[model samples]
Target: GSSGSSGHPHIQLLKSNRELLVTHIRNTQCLVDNLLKNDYFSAEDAEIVCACPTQPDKVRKILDLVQSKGEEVSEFFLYLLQQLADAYVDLRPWLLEIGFSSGPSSG
Candidate 1:
């Protein structure tokens, strides 16, 4: 995940199936919407209710780079991330597969 640690920019060469991230975002949005309708929280509270640390601007930085490349992978990747979460299983093999590397298998 720290592959972007060298300041490559957010979502740069990113292939993560951001399932957990999208779930949190949608859940947060729902909570904020309910609060707004019920007047349980202020508009400002809803505006800042996002759980993702990196806001749109941060995500846009990476998107900008890819936008000019004529490659529309961001949206697909987002969908993939969502699907990953939707298909998540508690099986040991699947659990272990979540954070494993695909480049090589250690002897």
Candidate 2:
């Protein structure tokens, strides 16, 4: 599952973040909390984070959208993802599964 994921560290990082965002967007708590606190929480935005451009062509669409805004947006997205993961005990392992480093890189 991780094949080709580690070839580019930064890409994998952004991909992991996008995956996190998608997961959270689907969560009821995240949808309500962001709208109440941040004044914004659009599923459309989540639908368009542009994470990994893998197979099925759907990947390219989002990746292209996100790339348009540049990496900074995704970096910020990552910060949010990390915060969200910290709030949920179960999400930590999911983050690892998607390529997030648990602690400094083992190798």
Candidate 3:
């Protein structure tokens, strides 16, 4: 998710830096808890978290959707993820799936 989600509690309370920091810290902690439970979690999950774009936690939702997909994505999936992220990370668009590799580049 965006460090400063457009309207997250943290961003929404930016008028008070302390509130912003505290809220985001809490959210981060919540995310950390989720990550500890599920080894794979990232911005990609946050992108599609909601059925509606207006909903929140797109990263987590997207991750669940990906995992429920019932099969590990192929190399081309990772490649496409990287390609997409490279092209549009700033947009926080969440279709990309970049991740660890099973082998070296030479493989």
> Judged by lDDT, which candidate is best?
2
TM-score of each: 0.25, 0.37, 0.28
Per-residue lDDT of model 2, residues 1-107, tens digit only = 45553334444564655554444433433433443365343456555432325332343344444444555544543455557776765457656676544567467
- Cα-based lDDT for every prediction: 0.39, 0.48, 0.35
Instruction: Tell how far residue 53 is off in model 1, in angstroms.
Output: 3.1
Model 3 CA deviation exceeding 4 Å by range: 1-56, 74-78, 89-107
- Please, what are the lDDT tens digits per residue for candidate 3 over residues 1-107? 54753433322222233332222221233433444355544555433443434323433343334444333422222233334444443422322222233456673
- Model 3 weakest lDDT span, ten residues long: 91-100
Which pairs clash inside model 2? 50-62, 50-63
In terms of TM-score, the best-performing candidate is 2
Query: Residue 53, candidate 3: how far off, in angstroms?
Result: 6.0
Each model's total of backbone clashes: 1, 2, 7
Model 2 / residue 106 / CA error / Å: 22
lDDT of 2 at 14: 49
Q: Residues 18-65, candidate 1: write the lDDT tens digits.
A: 343333333334433543575544555444445346554333332343
Model 1: lDDT to the true structure:
0.39
Ranking by TM-score: 2, 3, 1
Sorted by lDDT (best first), the order is 2, 1, 3
